[PDB]
Please model this.
Amino acid sequence: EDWDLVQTLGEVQLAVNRVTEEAVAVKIVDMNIKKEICINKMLNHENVVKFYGHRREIQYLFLEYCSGGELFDRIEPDIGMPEPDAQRFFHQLMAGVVYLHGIGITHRDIKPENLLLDERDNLKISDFGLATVFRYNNRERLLNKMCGTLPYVAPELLKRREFHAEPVDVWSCGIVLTAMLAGELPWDQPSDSCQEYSDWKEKKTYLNPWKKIDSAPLALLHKILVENPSARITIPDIKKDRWYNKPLK
Ligand SMILES: c1cc(-c2cnc3cnc(-c4cn[nH]c4)cn23)n[nH]1
Model:
């Protein structure tokens, strides 16, 4: 029953059980947090950070501990990571996202800061403070709230009053893939005012980060980073992508 607050992780602390020595993460929030707990209660997947419980003393959330830390730290600046590790993390990111979308949940803030790694280096999607329901009773609800982080955010979120939830997450996963591959973020935001975004739209891939990316992965990125959320590739189709299914190492 008794957990020692060993150290601060993120506030968030690592907790080690007094008897077991088991490690768990405790998110400390002094009074969005009611919804974060609700959503956590629905989630069970090996690519999502497991929820253990909560106690209302200041609110305390008990979350799986990931020794590996954030994926952000596995990306070398201006370099990225070896293509096979990227693909592996991407396969796990996809499995995690498929799951969430299956139980009608959208994370809404997918970035390497929120993708934790366990001891086996297995990816876990983390932090559902911005997540919301986009399907209930088999009924889809369009989203209108602006959420996320600007480099990661999809273009429709900027230019449209309402948008579908799933293509938004798919876009951020592609930005994440781009970061793993090139060790850099392509633009500050996906807007025409942004010069870098325009260059991509114009297909100038001889520029960075795209120049650092092999043709097979890049072909997938062309499918993912499509301005029209209706034309954008969907997850079931990412699954059929050649690079996605390319044996690596
Ligand atoms: C930064 C965060 C972490 C880490 C390791 N395990 C966890 C579990 N949950 C979190 C977390 C962070 N925000 N909300 C939950 C961070 N973790 N490591 N480095």
Q: What stands out?
A: Residues 9-10, 12, 25, 27, 49, 63, 65-66, 69-70, 116, 126-127 surround XEZ (CB under 6 Å).
